[PDB]
Amino acid sequence: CVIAWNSNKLDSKVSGNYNYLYRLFRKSNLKPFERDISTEIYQAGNKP
Amino acid sequence: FKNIDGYFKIYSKHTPIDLPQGFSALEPLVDLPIGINITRFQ
Amino acid sequence: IEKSNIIRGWIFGTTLDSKTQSLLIVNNATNVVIKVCEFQFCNDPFLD
């Protein structure tokens, strides 16, 4: 089962919150039920 | 040792005695929800 | 094929370093400890 609900009054601040982060770049697609917490920069070129 | 769908499974057996010629089975003993990427072991 | 319990445990992971995840299974004569953490290794892993 998947449950979703609203948390506007619990996760909204006038100055803005930045505690919640997501990931945008990765080399390969993710296996089901897998967790990765790496921090290495995305190698788009040759020089590290 | 097996690892599928984010679950780690371990079967084991013990017996008294090159490997001997005979037949025996193994019983399930560990299942864990580890869910990581495994490639090499020690 | 063993006597006197020389083989102790196992390590599983990707690169076996302080960077990414690692599983340790140790059997130090008292209990079967399974521990999945972010763990550091040396080049000569041994136990007394």
CB contact at 8 A, B32 and B38: no
- Interchain contact A36–B (C-beta under 8 A): yes
Q: Which stretches of chain B sit within 8 Å of chain A by CB? A: 5-6, 35-37
The arrangement of strands across the sheet holding C10-13 comes to B40-41, C10-13, C22-26, C33-37
Residues of B in contact with C35 (CB under 8 A): none
- Interchain CB distance below 8 Å, B37 and C12: no
Choose among B28, C38, C27: nearest CA to A36. Answer: C38
Both structure tokens of A5? 């609900």
Entry field: residues in chain B: 42
Compute the Cα dihedral for C13, C17, C23, C25 and give only its sign: positive
Residue B21 tokens, joined: 């010629």
Radius of gyration of chain B from its Cα atoms, rounded to whole angstroms? 14
Chain B touched by A27 (CB under 8 Å): no
CA distance linking residue A38 with residue B2, whole number of Å? 24
Task: Please give the backbone phi and psi of residue C26, each rounded to the nearest 5 degrees, phi first.
Answer: -125, 150
> Exposed e or buried b for every residue in C18-33, given b needs 16+ CB within 10 A?
eebbbbbbeeeeeeee
Cα(B11)–Cα(B9) distance, integer angstroms: 7
Which chain C residues are closer than 8 Å to B17 by Cβ?
Answer: 1
d(CA B6, CA C35): 16
| Residue-wise burial string across B10-34, b where 16 or more C-beta atoms lie within 10 A, e elsewhere | beeeeeeeeeeeeeeeeeeeeeeeb
What does the block give as tokens for A47?
Answer: 């020089």
Measured in angstroms, the resolution is 2.9
Please indicate whether, in this complex, the C-beta atoms of C13 and B17 are within 8 angstroms of each other. Answer: no
Between CA B26 and CA A21 the distance in angstroms is: 45
**CA nearest A37 in B: which residue?**
B36
How far is it, in rounded angstroms, from Cα C47 to Cα C11? 13
**Is residue C13 within 8 Å of C28, Cβ to Cβ?**
no
Chain centroid to CA C38: 13
